[model samples]
Target chain A: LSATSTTSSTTAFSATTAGNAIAGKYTISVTHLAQAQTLTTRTTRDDTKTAIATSDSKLTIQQGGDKDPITIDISAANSSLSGIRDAINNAKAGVSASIINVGNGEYRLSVTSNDTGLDNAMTLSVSGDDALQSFMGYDASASSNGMEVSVAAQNAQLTVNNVAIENSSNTISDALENITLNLNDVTTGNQTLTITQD
Target chain B: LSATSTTSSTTAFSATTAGNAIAGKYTISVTHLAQAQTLTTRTTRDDTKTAIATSDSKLTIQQGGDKDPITIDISAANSSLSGIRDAINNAKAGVSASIINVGNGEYRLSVTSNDTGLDNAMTLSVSGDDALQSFMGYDASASSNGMEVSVAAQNAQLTVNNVAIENSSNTISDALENITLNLNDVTTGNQTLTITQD
Candidate 1:
């Protein structure tokens, strides 16, 4: 939308318009297009910075779709935080692992599903040693281990002509019959995203 | 056990025990009646043996009787010879997984069900990437993989006093009026097993 008294090109405000606006110098307003969806899960920090105190525990990673879950063998004798990271990295399963260093070398092992869409979320089950899973701070059931979900994977939310619409993806098409918008971010304030055809 | 020798038309050997009778039929001749019920299945030896080829597949372990099948996911991408061995061994799903080294770096993964009854017999099925299963070499069908079954799981074979009887389980009871025999192993040569009523 046209901001009153727009200044230099490097200003915080910008505007653009399409053709055929009544072929006259008229006040023009615009709205931002919707954006694509991005999904991310919680990042964690572990206060229990000690060796896992169990043995022969296995972790099963269950994912969506027709794909079978991946099972990783965890040994309490060897699987420390770093060791578990190595194991997950070596697994080549659809998830990636990284250590969240919360300073003082106290770290939490964080894992993320490589896939995006809503169905790609991951749930873990520990078969053998629950202690190891506890050390990693992940349990689908009790969900103990202080890992907070920083972001949840979700479909994008959008609005067109003041009419609210929902989509699983941030980039929605034909919401207004012939328009597509990639929602960049969410807005909590009463900031209106204006879109108009010339 | 003794049998009376009564050689005649259609009489291979005849035996009838008399109450403390010192007298017998004709001159005695004996035939071996040794039978034991034992079962073994094929063992695989691979020439390549470095590690299985890269293929993401699944292995379904089906046990006889009404037991539910157990499915294990395998990835040739990371599951080499030792990797799969660990996965199977750690699964603890009624089968013990081990590796048989056939010398000179040639290795084969072997799995044995924990049960011994005929109902415990296990079958392997490959799903997903078939190459991983092909390398393991234990499909119920005529598998294209070079792995061959050196032995097949079988039911215990036994006979009672010339009357043939079949029991899938080795520890059989009531095969004959009041007899129970735990057949340990099959007999290669003719041998007699003595059984007496208390």
Candidate 2:
């Protein structure tokens, strides 16, 4: 009728139905939680009121190994911090952007993969403007990049009942039949899960 | 009751009262309009969602010939583009900040003097953080600067009735008794202003 963990902070567990869950004791061990790739610009801006590009430019963003990258046109009229953020969000690409106001006339732009997995990591490139290129160009494999990875894309690694399981998201439903496990944090040791008919 | 110009596009004129007009013909020539100092970060940021400073820093902004420069404290928590803008605006240091996105993930921060005049020109300097300094430190007299001037602080230059005049603002009310002249744009030739009884 219910599921509980020995370490309550590690994860939350639930069952679809009492009949679906077998009356038994299970062990769950979480090595790490799934994380979306987050990247931040290394360069900072002091002003957010003037366009940075001198001419039209193209911004290309692609997920890992994706052939068709989303290309956004950057023009003088739409070349402001909020403008770029809107453009990226309007495209509905697998990435999102936002602006952070650091104090003392400093600001940074941050982008993140919408999905939590290695395959969803983002690679950014810019063309047609040197300034824009310097601002946005990033490649994880490159020697140098304009962006720094704040969080790396990763899959959740866990073991259930001594059986290995991996998933792209923290919420794992397929690991157990008619049951779901929501990983909240990494566990220091194995957690005990008990399912019994009430 | 009406004031018309030979070149209507150059300027707009008005009199305080009909009796104040001496029914004389006047020529007005505008060379330039007053402009505030607008400076933008030469570096563009691709992300606006993360803090840019790694440590605490100080930002000093001062007007021309001002002994008391406004100093703002920048911490890692408030070192983003918008953070710096709010800090500068909160200081009420005669300067304002904003962000401009130039498409392609390129965002720039722009700072402008709130007041227009050569005396209101601004000089920016940052300390304690190299990254913050590189993003904000600017001096018009310096050979190298992190910021570039988009518009220089300047006085309006014009001539009314063939008498040269200069003011810190485009709207000149002191030149003539009970008459106000608003300089709109630079003129190629002298504009004729006829003050006749309506």
Candidate 3:
């Protein structure tokens, strides 16, 4: 048996046949793709040369369903915008951080989750110092937060053979009996998948 | 029986007969007077018109021997230096807060314990918002505290009849029988107290 997928938008498709595979035509419709949560400091500074925190502090980041939050120490040695980025990256704490220079001396710190999905949504807290907390503390449900959600974490919404399916990842493997689908982009319309027996 | 106190410096002396009075001459020397702890925000802003906190937050103040800390709600409506002073004073939480305009667009928030003594010293903390913490959070032992200690809490140190005495308050009553000595200022030298029978 062989499988073929056809869609107007770009996507990666793969299929493997096991005894569970039944050769038949299938219809695939993808409406939304999974995304990772991204957060950015709401306040901007004039330049990156100034230290954000003058003393050692803690920045705690925890994802949904995490057992414990990961704490990153922010000391005077690594308190600059770029220095903070490097420290967060060095932590390898399932988050990638960067400093965005918005020109004319405006700099902001942006952080994005390594995984895509609602379960990977990040919540940040701070302690041990006031200056660090002023710049990094964030709560998704709070009325006022230091960091704003740049992009929200979401699940992939799609349907196969008229059956609605949802997945935290863009890759759909369990939807089919023996086939897997990797979604790269949202399709404008329904896509056709053909499975035939040789 | 009567009691008379003579000192080159200022002092208030009162005595009454209750059968505990003793007729003797006493030499009194006051080295230090009890004082209340005072804290001032280390950072100063250009003006008091600007809101210190854009959103609602909590400021927790606890005295050394307090059973529980008092949490004061700091909303945008009362987020200025002067506004904070009113909120704290309204709370009646054993502390008096004021705003000091240091001229040239400089303003600072000063907080002092209502009661004088080491036990009345205050520890301040903040939560629920970032801006409030940046301006109000203070730990006495912290290396980088938002508020600085303007005056430290202390006990009154004085000597009567060549005997040392320490009291949290400036008024010493139990030291001398049926007599209360209120310290007005530090004595330059030993003062003379004469007790005689009438």
Candidate 4:
């Protein structure tokens, strides 16, 4: 569902948004970023993303930022739903996109923030005429999980031995790698993590 | 099965002799390195880091050398096969692992090198009393996919319109941003993406 291309960048792109839809409903997510992040929280079947409902391809930050600068060719045959999914699963671009099929034809486009925040938010702005907002079935009404930039991980908190550490690997699954810690202790306060990007 | 790790260190300890066995196969992968430019083809797989036909509880990596330390506990009482699958699927670790059921009371342990290179080549030395490797249809020699790193786009020596470059975002699913590339061209050679982890 994706048309391949050739591009280059030393940086990454992530998307973030905040909005909410009715429970037990479907929502469409869309993104025009260069790559797509994984659609986590799939277990929350009560929600979804769709194209027909959104009227156009779903838009959500698959990776990087919803505002990250990306180049996508929607005119290409497979550049819609199929195109975005491919990018997210494979990271085709410096960005990614997704269209979650929330039940009842509703979707909330979600974006992933850059691994290195503040400087790396995706540089994206609508250009094409056929964005989700302009589509017939889709309407742009922000819901929970709307694009945002915060100093908190959805779950995995960067920490080390009860002390907040900045540069720990984003995802340290080595349960033994206690050199990296989970900041379960900072739940009550604003969590901040600092990272240096190349 | 997995366990709660009690301790950890930046430096791995000496390799322990094989011990017990479990009923499944296990693996670990190192995809990201905190320190870069320190390794280039400095790794190998030894039987000491293979499978346990009777146990699935040990997962550890030694420090020093070109490899970055990685370890996971895959015991049912602590960590289980389900846990590893969840972790990898969730992108919880820089690496990923899995079990291969080969039948005949024998299961071939398969793992993926997430970091994708000789320098990131992680050793999965198993150190528990177990006869599974030497027992479970133990064919010390066999042509297989064991200890192999799935060639990710990030590992390739990529070029865009003849311009060589580095790509850190491993997966390539999003739309092409700037005539992008994945370095899948094994013909010319993979795009050797250098990620500077400072």
Give the TM-score of each candidate. Answer: 0.34, 0.48, 0.46, 0.24
True contacts kept of 1: 0.00
Looking at the true structure's interface, with contacts defined as alpha carbon pairs within 8 Å between chains A and B, what fraction does model 4 recover? Answer: 0.00
**iRMS of each prediction in angstroms?**
30.9, 24.4, 32.3, 16.6
lDDT of 4 by residue, B41-157 (tens): 112222223423345644454322344555545543323333534433354344444333211122222333344433443444434524322221111134331233222212333
What proportion of the true contacts does each candidate reproduce? Answer: 0.00, 0.00, 0.00, 0.00
Minimum summed lDDT over a 10-residue window in model 3 chain B is located at B5-14
Candidate 3 lDDT tens digits, A1-198: 444433322343434454545666667778887877778888887766677787877888888865468998888877887778778888888888866543223667778887778999988887877776778778888888888887778898987888998888876777667767777556666566666565
lDDT of 1: 0.48
Model 3 quality (TM-score): 0.46
**Lowest summed lDDT over 10 consecutive residues: which window, candidate 3 chain A?**
A5-14
What local distance difference test score does each model get? 0.48, 0.73, 0.74, 0.30
lDDT of 4 by residue, A119-191 (tens): 2344222233344323211112334221332223332223221221222223332321111222222232222
Stretches of candidate 2 exceeding 4 Å from the true structure: A1-19, A65-68, B1-198
Kindly list the per-residue Cα lDDT of model 2 for residues A14-68, writing each as its tens digit.
3333244666677878887787877777787776666878888788998975547
What DockQ does candidate 4 have relative to the true complex? 0.01
Which CAPRI tier for candidate 2?
A: incorrect
Per-residue lDDT of candidate 1, residues B1-198 (tens digit): 432221221122222232332332222112222221111223334432344546677777777778888888877654575676667667776766545432222345555565554566666666765466555545446645434433344555554345565555555554533333444344443444432332
- State model 4's lDDT: 0.30
Residue A104, candidate 2: Cα error in Å is 1.5
